[PDB]
Amino acid sequence: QNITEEFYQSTCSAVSKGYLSALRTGWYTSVITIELSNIKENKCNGTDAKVKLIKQELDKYKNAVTELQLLMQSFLGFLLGVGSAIASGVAVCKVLHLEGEVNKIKSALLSTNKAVVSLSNGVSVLTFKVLDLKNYIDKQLLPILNKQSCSISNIETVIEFQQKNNRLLEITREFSVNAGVTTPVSTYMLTNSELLSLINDMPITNDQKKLMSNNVQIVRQQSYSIMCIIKEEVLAYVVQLPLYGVIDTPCWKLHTSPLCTTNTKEGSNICLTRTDRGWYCDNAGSVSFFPQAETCKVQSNRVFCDTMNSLTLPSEVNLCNVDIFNPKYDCKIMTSKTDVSSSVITSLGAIVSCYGKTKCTASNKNRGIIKTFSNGCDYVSNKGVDTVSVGNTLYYVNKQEGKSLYVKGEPIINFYDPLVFPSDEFDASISQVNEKINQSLAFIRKSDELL
Amino acid sequence: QNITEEFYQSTCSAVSKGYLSALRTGWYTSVITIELSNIKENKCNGTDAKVKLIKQELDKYKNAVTELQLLMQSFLGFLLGVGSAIASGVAVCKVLHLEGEVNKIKSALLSTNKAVVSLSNGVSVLTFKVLDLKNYIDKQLLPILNKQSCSISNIETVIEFQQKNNRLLEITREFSVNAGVTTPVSTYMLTNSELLSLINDMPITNDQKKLMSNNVQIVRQQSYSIMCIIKEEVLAYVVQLPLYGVIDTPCWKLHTSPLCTTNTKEGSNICLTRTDRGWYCDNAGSVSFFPQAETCKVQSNRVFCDTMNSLTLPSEVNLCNVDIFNPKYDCKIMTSKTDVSSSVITSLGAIVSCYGKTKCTASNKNRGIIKTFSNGCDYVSNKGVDTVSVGNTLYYVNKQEGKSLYVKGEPIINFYDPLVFPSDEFDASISQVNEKINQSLAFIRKSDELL
Amino acid sequence: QNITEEFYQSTCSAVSKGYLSALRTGWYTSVITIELSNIKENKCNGTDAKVKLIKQELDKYKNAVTELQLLMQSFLGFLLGVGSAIASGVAVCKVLHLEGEVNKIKSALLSTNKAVVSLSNGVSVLTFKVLDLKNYIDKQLLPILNKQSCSISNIETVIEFQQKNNRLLEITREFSVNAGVTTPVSTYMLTNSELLSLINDMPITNDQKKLMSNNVQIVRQQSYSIMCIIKEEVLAYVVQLPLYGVIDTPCWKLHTSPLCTTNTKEGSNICLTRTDRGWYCDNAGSVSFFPQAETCKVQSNRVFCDTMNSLTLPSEVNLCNVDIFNPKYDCKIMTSKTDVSSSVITSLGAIVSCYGKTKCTASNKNRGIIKTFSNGCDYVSNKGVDTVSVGNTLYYVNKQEGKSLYVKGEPIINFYDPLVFPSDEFDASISQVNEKINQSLAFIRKSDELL
């Protein structure tokens, strides 16, 4: 009673109605800090191998921070309108680039390593100091790295320093590996426990707090982080997390398959597909449409998506799933004249657009070919099948738990007749196709009528 | 006598006929295991720095496994029909999520670290236990990590534990860095020698055994691996490898370039291109067509490609490489009215579609401009040339060993005449354009005839 | 006086005029070397933990080199014409694959670890030997890893070996993680100081030397490196860096937004957009056009971009930013009949194509909705606004420092009248649309006139 599927043979499409929405309708900034060291150049007249190892670790840190210094930033689906993803994080970083704020933040983070602070620009942020380099470089090496008496026989010193250093070393590596702008953000930028604390300490609802505290595995792919500053003794870098202002809304996915007439002639065929495959999630009384499935992700029953690849479509667009011909909303489709075979993957099955003469088949691992189709839009579930072959592609079927419904109906392609139809339409719709057909009929008849 | 190239001026295209097919026409699952530990909380009243390091390593492992726990997962080229890549691996994982299977798998992997086992779902799988955390956490730290007598003076304990831990630490990092779903799979998911053993021990032919045992460098980009379970004492995760049911078939690549008329007028130009650039590999008596070159990969004379971006086209489509006008198969093309310069790069040459008036040139590193072209498709080889400039782009030419053939012929664009042609066609073909020309001529003449 | 923005309401577009060009109009090869070891199999009858650790490190290296061995390298925007990116690097690698050159390269790098050498093929290349495995495997282990007297009590030996090994271990890892072909190249392929030295040493101008010495953060995304050889005692791999033959030219970005009529009817609407969003950079008296923004990158007021996704367009195309109707250059546009809302992001603002009836709004973080638009092309700046919502998407606006100009003008859509316009045009232009409209008018009138 949570997820299921229904496939309409009326226009040859599948609907997976079980997933629960997770829309990042808000952003959230958090400036993390790591207390650096303006180390004075090391100096030991006389080389012990442990001393050389300590020197090499310090020099590796120095190359890390030199790198960081130099990197301180010194088919429908084509009308969405792109957006500046990194605007908020780099805007906060810019707010930091004003001279005074860094001392304020450092003072606010002197005692603890987590605090809510108000920047110069008014919007409150939450900041961390996860790794402290000043302590373990000042009061653990300098008192024991004296000029001449470089007695560092304790080997484990270098091991502790390396374990407390590799985190920031990978931070600088990722700064230099992703143009200072990376997604996902690795744990060396924010430890998972630190992430849980951040989610628990930020201003969102308790249900959303639990929701985003236990759902890390997708957030990183919906998160971002650019460098802010090394201004004074500290490495400060912003993180951009989501804020689910829309939750607990039942939203679904739409998969598409061509309809065609099935004349024995391989050529002169007429084919129609629904060009609206993607995601529909309900937020504010109208659906949110993601055209390209590369902007949405799946987690069991929670689908996590970013709305910046979304439009808001009227709720009447849902009626395009029952009657594509209704005039309430002009459903979007694409027409073409090429006859070839293929199949598409729904949540619990696959739609075989078996066109031409390819030997399409549905089978299970241990049974083999159990069903053979015949030249047309057909659908098969996942229940007893996990291998559908068309031509030479052998697709698997996701074996999630659900109930499959198959609505019979005469394909609309039957209504469309050849010899008049236009053989080129991708951004077309029902209304546009009908208008063009009426225009062609009027021209043909008036040309004949005038006789 | 292995690879060569031939360029047809009839449609301004190039054909690279040397590569040998490697088609993933089958999938193969393998559930890897690593024997975990539900370590009892460590305890030492009195802190020694080595004990501190041991505790930090144990806590790093504990954060790794906390992450693992929390991440539990339950132009032509637009009609292919996408496919579920992760269906088989997550389906096997789901089979594992049944309570009883993990105990059987563990029992079958108690003695060795490689065995073929039959899951509950029927399809036999092969599993390893590459890394064993239970041993080095049970009988080599606990007996030496007693409550009070935490005598761990031996430093190399931590070194050995870290070297046996970093593998699974990277496993969990990658699980949290790729939504538990990554491609390629890093070696910490399957060591290189373990992978050779896996290939040698699984059910494929001896020739294919040698074949894909020595073809590692590409498989990882055709491999996949999602996390299955942490159920009982073990970390188990699936790996999805290809099964080359089609091999030793000589397959080729198609590169495309626009034909146009060469009127002195920059505007009012008419241009046609072959819109079928991509890969053709022969499997079962008909060719397999990959439209977008981002689904096929190259290594010497053997090309490894994924079939889910493949259609099966009639063998007569090969005839589109000799006579685009042949009525056996309607060759696919695109027509447009924009006149600009460009060039394309085949396996052994470069096609300069020098249009407009850009100064196109063919040159070598130590010579410079050696050939200057003039307003149309010209083609140049790789032999003495490795720098072709058009406008301000300066392309290199792949220097593989081959023999170049250049078929002369009058471009079809000459047959097409202006003043009637439609200036918008991307999914068009020879038959479609001919039918549209029929319609335009009939309308123009009947309009004049009725006078 | 460095960057600003101007938005034309005539065609509903934004121009960001401040960025400075960085065009990779040349390539540069550099073969890096690391002096390997053909280690004789280790042998110690009697197991000490230090000895086992040394053996495990040696075996990890041996698996690294086994991996290396087996991976021996045996909308407008669709007409650009792709190019062989890895041609130069693998061509140099091939030049190395001739038997003798590796000895010359090794000898030329016997004393220092940086030198210019002339390959067999004539084009000079500069090579380093950054990491030396022969020394620390020959004259630091063999004299102290004798058959029986394996007295390696010194623990730090393994630490030094591991720190000098991890670089090449990750080099082989990246060879096997990116099909031997990766971008960006990690620091373990070229230390950042080594990169600065390389830039200071390679043949480019002094201004260009400083220019590419201080700009590492972006270069790696324009760099490439394939495996060349393991021929004799050395691991040699090429690196492919840009050569800015065009610099100090002021170049800009173009952002697009639909124009439409504003009838109360949601259907039967007519819409036009400028289909030329992308990058324009001046190189040789004519502009360079990058259609898809995924081939260009940004840093401060300086844009670093790759030219293989660039065409050379006449300077008159700049006039399409003032008079789209000018006949000098036929400006490229797209027309469609679908009425939906959206917005696009320029360098200092956002263009709201608020169409249909969506509640679009412009707001600041601490102020909220400050501006409400009304059913049409409108534009808003970055100054007092950083939150533009359309429907349910909530975009941020980049807060860079600039001056915003808003040219008023009657949208060209007003001139276009309904009932005759074609509802399908993506690769269309002003001239093509006018020709089609004139054809339709002539047909309608002659049909009526003949009466």
Ligand SMILES: *[C@@H]1O[C@H](CO)[C@@H](O)[C@H](O)[C@H]1NC(C)=O
């Ligand atoms: C176009 O030519 C005639 C038009 O009179 C038409 O009958 C024919 O089918 C078309 N194709 C040809 C002639 O190849």
